[PDB]
Amino acid sequence: QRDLVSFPLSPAVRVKLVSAGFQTAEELLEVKPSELSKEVGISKAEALETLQIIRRECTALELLEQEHTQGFIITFCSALDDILGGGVPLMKTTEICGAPGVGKTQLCMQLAVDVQIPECFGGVAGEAVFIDTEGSFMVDRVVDLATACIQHLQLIAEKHKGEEHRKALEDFTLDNILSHIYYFRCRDYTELLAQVYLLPDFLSEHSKVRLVIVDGIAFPFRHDLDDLSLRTRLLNGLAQQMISLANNHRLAVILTNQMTTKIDRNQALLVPALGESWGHAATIRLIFHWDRKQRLATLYKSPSQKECTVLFQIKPQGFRDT
Amino acid sequence: LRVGLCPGLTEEMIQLLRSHRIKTVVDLVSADLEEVAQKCGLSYKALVALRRVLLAQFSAFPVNGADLYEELKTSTAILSTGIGSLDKLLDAGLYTGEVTEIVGGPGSGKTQVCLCMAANVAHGLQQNVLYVDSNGGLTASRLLQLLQAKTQDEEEQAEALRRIQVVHAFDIFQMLDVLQELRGTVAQQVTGSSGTVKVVVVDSVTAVVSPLLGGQQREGLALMMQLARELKTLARDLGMAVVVTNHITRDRDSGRLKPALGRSWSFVPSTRILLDTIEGAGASGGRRMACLAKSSRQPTGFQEMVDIGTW
Amino acid sequence: DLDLLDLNPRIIAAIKKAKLKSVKEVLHFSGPDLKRLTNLSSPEVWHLLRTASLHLRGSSILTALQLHQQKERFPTQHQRLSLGCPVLDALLRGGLPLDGITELAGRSSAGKTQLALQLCLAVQFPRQHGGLEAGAVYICTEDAFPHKRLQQLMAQQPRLRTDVPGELLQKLRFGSQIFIEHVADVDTLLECVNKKVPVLLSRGMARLVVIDSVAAPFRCEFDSQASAPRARHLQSLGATLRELSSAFQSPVLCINQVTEAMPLGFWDERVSPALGITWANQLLVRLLADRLREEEAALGCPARTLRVLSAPHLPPSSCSYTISAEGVRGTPGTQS
Ligand SMILES: Nc1ncnc2c1ncn2[C@@H]1O[C@H](COP(=O)(O)OP(=O)(O)OP(=O)(O)O)[C@@H](O)[C@H]1O
Ligand SMILES: Nc1ncnc2c1ncn2[C@@H]1O[C@H](COP(=O)(O)OP(=O)(O)OP(=O)(O)O)[C@@H](O)[C@H]1O
Ligand SMILES: Nc1ncnc2c1ncn2[C@@H]1O[C@H](COP(=O)(O)OP(=O)(O)O)[C@@H](O)[C@H]1O
Ligand SMILES: [Mg+2]
Ligand SMILES: [Mg+2]
Ligand SMILES: [Mg+2]
């Protein structure tokens, strides 16, 4: 016995059905549509729609095999990969927070470049989708990062002196890697929601995409939005849609956040913005902050590893160690 | 009315009784049937017999207390959570047939506790367990680590993992669909005695309920109540151990910690566990606070110290 | 606009009964709000959202290769605005980007207003010499406009700019294409940037905006216990400025003051930008003009240094410059 409330039917048709004495989905399957339609005063089209929507409504070993057969996305940071278990995990939503100038955008560019590394070197060999909300995407920086990756991979392959490594690196050229990054631009949050809604079919046609980046999510939602409840509902819906998409399409998702100041008594602490309930949305959360002239990466929340602190650096080659 | 459900119904009487109402059998049972014999023309002796048999097959009959006592003496059971602190906190494990709710802050302990309990039940008792992951917070490497911490035989670990089933539901409708599918398949498979599921864990109910709430609408609250009713009937009418996790909110007027999803959801579970992180000294790591906020067999307000990094 | 969508008449009638206007306010609301207002089931609401989103954003696909190769179609990624000095241009690798906010910060006598005037002079040079062939907008929030300095700069322009052919400068009418505005309050500044700058930018009169001080109006009203309205105003101003700059492909330059530091990248420094992290989040390129007066002043000349604080594409570096009778000149061979 399945209640009608458990189905995504129209409120009007459900009101009519409960008026006519309908409370179970099982009894609906044994009645001709004409008789029920003339009894409840419902036209043929919506009756057929109700009939079809009613009709339409993986052991852990397989999960282990799937997790092991697909790798992580390397960040060119050995310690960060070690504390992440191998890099950014697929099927998981990741969040990055930090004060301006720490290097969130550099990390996003590095990930977009690295996601196309051939699997012979431990990569995923997939495309990337970059969504920009603040206009901080500079092509020259991406070119520099791609050239640095080219040089590093070429040196590693030459030192190892294999055979299939050279073949894999043959097609791994600047034009090929630059042609596999898809760029979108959103100004208002309505445009971001529209692009999110269009994402499923686009990923369906572009089945080789293995990365989705949304650089800047606090900016579209922190200005000219007085109603806090509406913002909370929109953010919850966006998080649910993003995790559903990431799991369905075998994707790694990275979101970028901004810090804010919380004042208690007479001392101030830097905390991530967008309220407290937003903390449950991200599967993995990282925080970048300054200490003297050193940059530190802290794993704040994660259901697989332990809290750690990592020293990283930004160089002309890009995101690196030390 | 419906045809073929009970004997004695004629194809003429069903359209004859159209005079009063057509909605449900409540028209037949909740009417003054004396006037029906002349309003439409019916035999008195057949009408009462039909009403009696229909009421018999379409209701429930009370069961004496002694019979229920005896049957629970041989049916119910208790399943340990794998943590001595929790076990001594809630009397050496949770009881099947009730609803257990775990409430905590972001990242405190909920998913880890659920995973460790599932690993214990799958290995220490050799029973099937279903996991409903909604927020994506379930990695198989954590389960493998817990199983390695328990035993070392590879085949034992594989067999224990083979009793764990995971389903993904990112909205209320998918969760309702999978729960109703489990209800149907178990109710149909009552004849057998192998492969049954005794514990089902919902990773997060706030993930699929919060978008519906907020505003002046009513459908979200009705859907939440329907999900609660389904979980309660699955736990009680079948004798299963259900564990769900929920978020925690900070009140505005009073500033006290309060479970999410509101007052209507506040009455749903029977046993409440609250997890908090110990600030200042002893922070981080596994060191955390476990408290009992609601129980039908223990006084509330008690305190207990537990760790989530020693298993 | 709603009837342009391809949809069955039932949902069109439901939307019309629901008091909807265009796709923007359809996407403004959420799922449950639409269910409550319009009384529709989930599948058709999802279909309507999908169709409206497809109509709004189109169906075009863009790759980074197209951005890199096609210079003319995407000037924002390649076109830059010169500062009038080759050393400064080398430090900035071409000059100011056309999209986003650039900030100058420093204490008094650093030389911010001189650089602003020089940029206002050089914006209207021909394309091949770094200019944009457009006017400039100047907003003053603290005091009067430097008239004599401007006149001297226009007079010295042939001397300062020597690479441009001499016969070309006389046709350039400098003072007639610079606009001056004055405001005296935060609300006045908000209203001005809301309903005056877009009018100037729409007609092509100017393609450059300069604010001589953003901290000056804000440091007078809001005290240390009113940070929320201050942050709201700062966010609104930054959003409006970024929207205008993106729409009209015109650089925006902001002049800022400094405070005393008594976690944000400033440890071995005694001064920091004034507004705070809320305003610092709205920026793209951050510079810091600094004059070291307490030391190395006995050598006889001031020591002025321009430093790049942060930028998505520029490494942290600094150079030296001097202010003379003809304008700001960078010292060759001093980049960090
Ligand atoms: N080896 C380990 N593996 C996994 N988690 C660990 C380990 N050691 C410690 N932890 C802790 O496990 C916690 C995982 O949090 P968990 O997901 O169980 O909480 P939660 O309240 O359910 O979170 P969420 O709201 O994000 O769903 C982390 O906060 C981390 O500190
Ligand atoms: N011929 C000149 N004409 C004008 N200023 C000159 C000249 N030669 C050198 N200078 C220097 O130019 C500087 C102009 O300072 P400027 O107006 O740019 O300051 P600022 O950084 O905007 O400060 P404030 O916060 O007071 O506005 C002075 O310090 C002055 O010494
Ligand atoms: N070409 C480069 N060489 C060296 N360092 C650079 C280069 N480009 C940018 N950087 C550094 O990388 C950092 C980028 O920070 P960014 O990603 O913009 O932080 P956010 O996105 O949070 O504002 C800057 O602080 C800058 O110093
Ligand atoms: Mg950035
Ligand atoms: Mg969790
Ligand atoms: Mg000045």
Curated annotation (Swiss-Prot), chain A:
Main location: nucleus
Assembly description: Part of the RAD51 paralog protein complexes BCDX2 and CX3; the complexes have a ring-like structure arranged into a flat disc around a central channel. The BCDX2 complex consits of RAD51B, RAD51C, RAD51D and XRCC2; the CX3 complex consists of RAD51C and XRCC3. The BCDX2 subcomplex RAD51B:RAD51C interacts with RAD51. Interacts with SWSAP1; involved in homologous recombination repair. Interacts directly with PALB2 which may serve as a scaffold for a HR complex containing PALB2, BRCA2, RAD51C, RAD51 and XRCC3. Interacts with HELQ. Interacts with DNA damage up-regulated protein DDUP.
Name of the protein in its database record: DNA repair protein RAD51 homolog 3
GO cellular component, one term: nucleus
Region forming the signal peptide: none
BP terms from Gene Ontology: DNA recombination; DNA repair; double-strand break repair via homologous recombination; female meiosis sister chromatid cohesion; male meiosis I; meiotic DNA recombinase assembly; positive regulation of G2/M transition of mitotic cell cycle; reciprocal meiotic recombination
Gene: RAD51C
The family this protein is said to belong to: Belongs to the RecA family. RAD51 subfamily.
Swiss-Prot record, chain B:
Residue positions binding ATP: 104-111
GO molecular function: ATP binding; ATP hydrolysis activity; ATP-dependent activity, acting on DNA; ATP-dependent DNA damage sensor activity; DNA binding; gamma-tubulin binding; single-stranded DNA binding
InterPro entries according to UniProt: AAA+_ATPase, DNA_recomb/repair_Rad51_C, DNA_recomb/repair_RecA-like, HRR_RAD51_Paralog, P-loop_NTPase, Rad51D_C, RAD51D_N, RecA_ATP-bd
Keywords noted in UniProt: ATP-binding, Chromosome, Cytoplasm, Cytoskeleton, DNA damage, DNA recombination, DNA repair, DNA-binding, Nucleotide-binding, Nucleus, Telomere
Tissue: Expressed in colon, prostate, spleen, testis, ovary, thymus and small intestine. Weakly expressed in leukocytes.
Gene Ontology CC terms: centrosome; chromosome, telomeric region; cytoplasm; microtubule organizing center; nucleoplasm; nucleus; Rad51B-Rad51C-Rad51D-XRCC2 complex; replication fork
Taxonomic superkingdom: Eukaryota
PROSITE patterns reported for this sequence: RECA_2 (PS50162)
Record's subcellular location: Nucleus; Cytoplasm, Cytoskeleton, Microtubule organizing center, Centrosome; Chromosome, Telomere
Pfam family, one: RAD51D_N
Annotated region described as preferentially binds ssDNA, given as residue ranges: 1-80
KW Membrane (keyword) present: no
Gene Ontology biological process terms, A to Z: DNA repair; DNA strand invasion; double-strand break repair via homologous recombination; interstrand cross-link repair; reciprocal meiotic recombination; regulation of cell cycle; telomere maintenance; telomere maintenance via recombination
Disease: Breast-ovarian cancer, familial, 4: A condition associated with familial predisposition to cancer of the breast and ovaries. Characteristic features in affected families are an early age of onset of breast cancer (often before age 50), increased chance of bilateral cancers (cancer that develop in both breasts, or both ovaries, independently), frequent occurrence of breast cancer among men, increased incidence of tumors of other specific organs, such as the prostate.
Family: Belongs to the RecA family. RAD51 subfamily.
Name assigned to this protein: DNA repair protein RAD51 homolog 4
Swiss-Prot record, chain C:
An example Gene Ontology molecular-function term: ATP binding
Pfam families per UniProt: Rad51 (PF08423)
Entry keywords, A to Z: Acetylation, ATP-binding, Cytoplasm, DNA damage, DNA recombination, DNA repair, DNA-binding, Mitochondrion, Nucleotide-binding, Nucleus
CDD domains cross-referenced by the UniProt entry: XRCC3
Record flagged with keyword Mitochondrion: yes
Main location (coarse class): nucleus
One GO cellular component term noted in the UniProt record for this chain: cytosol
Residues holding ATP: 106-113
InterPro entries linked to this entry: DNA_recomb/repair_Rad51_C, DNA_recomb/repair_RecA-like, P-loop_NTPase, RecA_ATP-bd, XRCC3-like_C
GO biological process per UniProt: DNA damage response; DNA recombination; DNA repair; double-strand break repair via homologous recombination; double-strand break repair via synthesis-dependent strand annealing; interstrand cross-link repair; positive regulation of mitotic cell cycle spindle assembly checkpoint; regulation of centrosome duplication
Domain of life: Eukaryota
Protein location: Nucleus; Cytoplasm; Cytoplasm, Perinuclear region; Mitochondrion
Function comment: Involved in the homologous recombination repair (HRR) pathway of double-stranded DNA, thought to repair chromosomal fragmentation, translocations and deletions. Part of the RAD51 paralog protein complex CX3 which acts in the BRCA1-BRCA2-dependent HR pathway. Upon DNA damage, CX3 acts downstream of RAD51 recruitment; the complex binds predominantly to the intersection of the four duplex arms of the Holliday junction (HJ) and to junctions of replication forks.
Xref: PANTHER family: DNA REPAIR PROTEIN XRCC3 (PTHR46487:SF1)
Subunit structure: Interacts with RAD51C and RAD51. Part of the CX3 complex consisting of RAD51C and XRCC3; the complex has a ring-like structure arranged into a flat disk around a central channel; CX3 can interact with RAD51 in vitro. Forms a complex with FANCD2, BRCA2 and phosphorylated FANCG. Interacts with SWSAP1 and ZSWIM7; involved in homologous recombination repair. Interacts directly with PALB2 which may serve as a scaffold for a HR complex containing PALB2, BRCA2, RAD51C, RAD51 and XRCC3.
